[PDB]
Design a binder for this molecule. Structure first.
Ligand SMILES: Nc1ncnc2c1ncn2[C@@H]1O[C@H](COP(=O)(O)OP(=O)(O)O)[C@@H](O)[C@H]1O
Lengths: 360, 65
């Protein structure tokens, strides 16, 4: 009779486990019943602190009320600019909350671009280090000598040659957040608004995001136009070094400069990048064709021969169109034997570029 | 020690109160007697069965002082 008792015991165990599952279900149901009695709370912004117990809070899409804190809250946490949860009836601040927008085009984070990706900028890389690493790594040496850090470092040169690549490389070397300016939330000189744009420039960067800045329209402001230049000078002239608005500009042309910026502190460093060297272009080919599946022998010097007067972005779409014509002719591989003809056809009025075609 | 405080009555009064308002939890019990009796230990243990940190509040309704 032992086997029958064991069978009924096993069925009993199954039924007990089902009962435990029912226990979990009933506790969840009671928890949701308890949740039903809860009532939502309006989301508001604290404009100003009136007294130790009075606050001015404006609803996200409503009017502003003078209210009071609930009780067991840190009034230190309730500062002008914090998101809080007003009770919907007494309007009392029950709790605070962590905080698109214009900054939706402000960030332009560097990414994981490192030194290895950038090829043929050894002297340029050393210049960036000697200019920037001291303000980052050793700001105290400037106090040791007793001078404000240099702010304006101009890495002027042709666009598409890796200026932002160099900046991202050094940023990843120091793992510092590179906040390249995308105008919105950082526009200053833009004459549409005078001081609100100044406020966005300052507060969005440096204060919130630690340091490491850049600028867009790389040659626009470097080159009503006179008044625009005076306002630019007022924007950039000289700011507190506690907060870094380091203006690492990389204007595309030398003639797009004026003596009004050549003063140190305004634009001190003049890092110069010229047309990419043939060996530098070679290294750029190597790194950019790394990712492409290149089976067989590739003699990159032959494709170097006809790569004169190019930039890095040219070389990148050379690799991309290598892949494109590999798809078009069904080759998982890509060899130099057609690298030759591709480089034969990547030089015309609009630099020919995509017409290079034959490349696998 | 001859006393009777209902168990099921407490349970379903709490059921009703929690249905009305679930924020209210059993946290103790009360008796109007000016002095606690020798009996109160059993009632406090019974309440502890419903709330481990049960605190009994004596409310002297008769005297105003
Ligand atoms: N040294 C380099 N190594 C590898 N790729 C490069 C190098 N320089 C430039 N490139 C390529 O060329 C482009 C460079 O654009 P960039 O110089 O950042 O333009 P801008 O400075 O106007 O934003 C990038 O897409 C990058 O892939």
């Amino acid at each position: 009779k032992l086997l029958e008792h064991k069978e009924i015991d096993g069925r009993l165990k199954e039924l007990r486990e089902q009962l435990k599952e029912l226990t979990k279900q009933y506790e969840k149901s009671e928890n949701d019943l308890k949740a039903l009695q809860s009532v939502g709370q309006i989301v508001g912004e604290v404009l100003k602190q009136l007294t130790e117990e009075k606050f001015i809070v404006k609803a996200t899409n409503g009017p502003r009320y003078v209210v009071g804190c609930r009780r067991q809250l840190d009034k230190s946490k309730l500062k002008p600019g914090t998101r809080v949860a007003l009770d919907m009836t007494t309007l009392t601040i029950m709790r605070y909350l962590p905080r698109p927008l214009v900054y939706n085009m402000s960030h332009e984070d560097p990414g994981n671009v490192s030194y290895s990706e950038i090829g043929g900028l050894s002297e340029q890389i050393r210049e960036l280090r000697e200019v920037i690493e001291l303000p980052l790594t050793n700001p105290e040496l400037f106090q040791r000598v007793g001078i404000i850090p240099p702010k304006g470092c101009l890495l002027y040169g042709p666009p598409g040659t890796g200026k932002t690549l160099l900046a991202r490389a050094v940023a990843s070397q120091l793992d510092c957040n590179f906040l390249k300016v995308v105008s919105s939330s950082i526009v200053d000189k833009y004459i549409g608004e005078s001081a609100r744009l100044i406020r966005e420039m300052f507060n969005y960067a440096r204060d919130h995001q630690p340091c490491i800045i850049f600028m867009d329209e790389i040659d626009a402001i470097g080159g009503e136009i006179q008044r625009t230049l005076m306002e630019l000078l007022n924007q950039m002239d000289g700011f507190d070094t506690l907060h870094r608005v380091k203006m690492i500009m990389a204007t595309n042309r030398p003639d797009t400069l004026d003596p009004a910026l050549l003063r140190p502190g305004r634009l001190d460093r003049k890092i110069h990048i010229d047309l990419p060297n043939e060996q530098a272009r070679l290294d750029i080919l190597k790194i950019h064709a790394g990712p492409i599946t290149k089976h067989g022998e590739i003699d990159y010097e032959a494709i170097v021969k006809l790569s004169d007067g190019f930039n890095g972005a040219d070389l990148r779409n050379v690799c991309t169109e290598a892949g494109m014509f590999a798809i078009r002719a069904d080759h998982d591989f890509v060899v130099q034997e057609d690298f030759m003809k591709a480089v034969r056809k990547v030089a015309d009025s609009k630099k020919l570029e995509s017409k290079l075609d034959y490349k696998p | 020690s001859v006393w009777f405080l209902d168990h099921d009555y407490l349970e379903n009064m709490y059921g009703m109160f929690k249905k009305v308002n679930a924020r209210e939890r059993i946290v103790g019990w009360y008796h109007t007697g000016p002095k606690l009796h020798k009996n109160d230990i059993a009632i406090n243990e019974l309440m502890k069965r419903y709330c481990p940190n049960s605190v009994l509040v004596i409310i002297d309704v008769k005297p105003k002082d």
